[PDB]
């Protein structure tokens, strides 16, 4: 289990708030040594930030696999011609970064991957028997956003797990859509986020199949109207049967009202949601599921032979989690006046060890000992071993958001004890040096 010492690390703390940051999470990612802007909307992820980014990446992956989706990797650069096949090339917009290689071939930095995935599908898959199929990757995208803004939350280069489903009819597709809906409730739950499924902007297709998963915040960009009972709903444990019928679970979440400003009916809101249960607020879109049937398979001629032996365009859906952007949501949703409060499951380190008289023989040895014992039992452990006063060490440990602190000085070591602090709520428990490892 990974383990670092600050004096061997790279963690550039900024004492003061950077002018260029408006919302709290940007403001905090910069001070917490997690980020550097390289161009507008384009970020280097500094060591601490990358660790968090990796953890979010892993969780998202685990839930995709748990739901049966298969991981591959598509390239950043796509041919224009591919996009011409589907009629999105000129249609997508100026946010698509266009590139010309040395041979004047037209490529773009992919903002997304429907055409590409379809291309891949039609090259290999021929019979209804291979389906359902859910193919996904976690990969960098570009949208030449008009005003790159809010640090990681409206950037231009950004990390997204995008998933793509392939079914025989609308029936199978809605089944695949359920699978991802469930996978998503779990995903966000595992990140200490209550993200709410909300019916969101459908295309010319109509119907019900489109949901944005939204975390609530007054700082947020998307506006919402919700029946508060939805904040209390339970999130399927890890044993959910994904070959089964999730309609129950889906009904449990769609039954109660949930909508964004785009598809909101005042006349239906008033008809379903009791006066006191209503809440008009805003939120942060962290995930997005969208069923698009034969939109791509038509133009691209991605067909399979049905269970009656005739060729049909496949029905598909796509499912995106804003991986890089979660970093910004998680912090908005998890901070206080002292800085970040990482949920355990996404923190860059589980515990930091703080030396309150660094250089003194006895405490230095106790730190080493805990450093090494916590290391051996697969715990992510930073040991702040810098030549710096307790006060400085607290402000940083608190700033960077590590879930547990361990305070170690000659004081407590006198009666053979260390202070353990739980960041989220300030809980503290002066403890015996020999017990703390027992978590």
Ligand X SMILES: Nc1ncnc2c1ncn2[C@@H]1O[C@H](COS(=O)(=O)NC(=O)[C@@H]2CCCN2)[C@@H](O)[C@H]1O
Q: For binding to ligand X (CB under 6 A), which residues are involved? A: 112-113, 143, 145, 154-155, 158, 160, 162, 205, 285-288, 318-322, 324-325
Does 157 help bind a second copy (rule: CB under 8 A)? yes
CB 316 within 8 A of CB 370: no
Shortest reach from residue 3's CB to a second copy, in Å: 10
Q: Please choose which of a second copy, ligand X, none residue 143 contacts, taking the beta carbon within 5 to 8 angstroms, the exact cut-off set by kind.
A: ligand X
Q: How far is CA 282 from CA 18, 57, 198, 369, 416, in A?
A: 26, 26, 12, 48, 50
Q: Please choose which of a second copy, ligand X, none residue 295 contacts, taking the beta carbon within 5 to 8 angstroms, the exact cut-off set by kind.
A: none
Which residues in the 53-92 window bind a second copy by CB under 8 A? 53, 68, 70-79
Q: Please choose which of a second copy, ligand X, none residue 162 contacts, taking the beta carbon within 5 to 8 angstroms, the exact cut-off set by kind.
A: ligand X
Options 17, 18, 140, 306; binder of a second copy; rule CB under 8 A: 140
CA distance 400 to 419: 19
Q: Please choose which of a second copy, ligand X, none residue 318 contacts, taking the beta carbon within 5 to 8 angstroms, the exact cut-off set by kind.
A: ligand X
The number of residues that bind a second copy (CB under 8 A) is: 54
CB 31 within 8 A of CB 339: yes
Q: Please choose which of ligand X, a second copy, none residue 325 contacts, taking the beta carbon within 5 to 8 angstroms, the exact cut-off set by kind.
A: ligand X
CB 53 within 8 A of CB 325: no
Fill in the per-residue mask, 89 to 128: x = in contact with a second copy (CB under 8 A), - = not in contact. -----xx-x-x-xx--x-x-x------x--xx--xxx---
Which helix or strand (DSSP H or E) is residue 410 part of?
Answer: helix 410-414
320-321-322-323 Cα dihedral, nearest 10 degrees: -130
Going by C-beta distance under 8 Å and a sequence separation of 6 or more, which residues neighbour residue 54? none
Residues 35-59 as b/e (b if ≥16 CB within 10 A, e otherwise) read: bebeeebebebbebbebbbebbbeb
**For residue 66, how many other CB atoms are within 10 A of its CB?**
17
55 vs 417, beta carbon nearer a second copy:
55
Among 201, 214, 211, CA closest to 289 = 211
26 vs 137, beta carbon nearer a second copy:
137
Does 213 help bind a second copy (rule: CB under 8 A)? no
Q: Please choose which of a second copy, ligand X, none residue 133 contacts, taking the beta carbon within 5 to 8 angstroms, the exact cut-off set by kind.
A: a second copy
Q: How far is CA 217 from CA 24, 65, 221, 339, in A?
A: 12, 30, 9, 17
212 vs 227, beta carbon nearer ligand X:
212
CA distance 273 to 278: 6
Q: Please choose which of a second copy, ligand X, none residue 348 contacts, taking the beta carbon within 5 to 8 angstroms, the exact cut-off set by kind.
A: none
For 385, counting Cβ atoms within 10 Å of its Cβ (0-12 exposed, 13-18 middle, 19+ buried), the class is buried
Shortest reach from residue 183's CB to ligand X, in Å: 13
88 vs 174, beta carbon nearer ligand X:
88
CA distance 236 to 344: 20
Q: Please choose which of ligand X, a second copy, none residue 293 contacts, taking the beta carbon within 5 to 8 angstroms, the exact cut-off set by kind.
A: none
CA distance 163 to 173: 13
183 vs 420, beta carbon nearer ligand X:
183
Which residue ranges make up the site for a second copy (CB under 8 A)? 8-10, 12, 33, 36, 38-40, 42-47, 49-51, 53, 68, 70-79, 94-95, 97, 99, 101-102, 105, 107, 109, 116, 119-120, 123-125, 133, 135, 137, 140, 142, 144, 146, 156-157
């Amino acid at each position: 289990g990974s383990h670092m010492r600050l004096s061997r690390f790279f963690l550039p703390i900024l004492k003061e708030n950077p002018k260029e940051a408006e919302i709290v999470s940007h403001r905090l990612m910069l001070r917490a040594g997690m980020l550097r802007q390289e161009a507008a909307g384009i970020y280097a992820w500094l060591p601490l930030g990358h660790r968090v980014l990796k953890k979010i990446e892993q969780i998202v992956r685990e839930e995709q696999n748990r739901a049966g989706a298969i991981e591959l990797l598509m390239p950043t650069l796509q041919l224009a011609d591919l996009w011409r096949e589907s009629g999105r090339y000129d249609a997508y917009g100026p946010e698509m970064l266009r590139i010309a290689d040395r041979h004047k071939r037209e490529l773009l930095y992919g903002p997304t991957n429907e055409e590409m995935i379809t291309e891949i599908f039609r090259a290999y898959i021929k019979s209804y028997k291979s389906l359902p199929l859910n193919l996904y990757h976690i990969q960098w995208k570009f949208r030449d956003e008009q005003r790159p803004r809010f640090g990681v939350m409206r950037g231009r280069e950004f990390l997204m797990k995008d998933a793509y489903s392939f079914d025989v009819d609308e029936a199978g597709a809605r089944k695949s859509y359920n699978k991802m809906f469930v996978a998503y409730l779990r995903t966000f739950a595992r990140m200490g986020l209550k993200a709410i499924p909300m019916r969101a902007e459908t295309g010319p297709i109509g119907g019900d199949l489109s949901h944005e998963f939204i975390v609530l915040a007054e700082t947020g960009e998307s506006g919402v109207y919700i029946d508060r009972d939805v904040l209390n709903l339970p999130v399927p444990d890890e044993n959910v049967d994904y070959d089964g019928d999730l309609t129950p679970i889906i009904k449990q979440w769609t039954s109660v009202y949930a909508a964004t400003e785009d598809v909101h009916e005042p006349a239906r809101y008033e008809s379903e949601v009791p006066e006191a249960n209503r809440l008009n607020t805003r939120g942060i879109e962290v995930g997005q599921i969208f069923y698009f049937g034969t939109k791509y398979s038509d133009s691209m001629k991605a067909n399979v032979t049905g269970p009656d032996g005739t060729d049909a365009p496949i029905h598909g859906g796509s499912y995106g989690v804003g991986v890089s952007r979660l970093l910004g949501a998680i912090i908005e949703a998890c901070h206080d006046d002292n800085g970040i409060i990482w949920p355990e499951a996404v923190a860059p380190f589980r515990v930091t060890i703080l030396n309150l008289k660094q250089g003194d023989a006895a405490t230095d040895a106790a730190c080493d000992q805990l450093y090494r014992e916590l290391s051996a039992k697969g715990v992510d452990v930073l040991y702040d071993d810098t030549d710096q006063r307790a006060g400085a060490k607290f402000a940083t440990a608190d700033l960077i958001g590590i879930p547990w602190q361990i305070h170690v000085g000659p004081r407590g070591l006198a009666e053979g004890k260390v202070e353990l602090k739980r960041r989220s709520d300030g809980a503290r428990e002066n403890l015996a040096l020999a017990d703390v490892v027992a978590r």
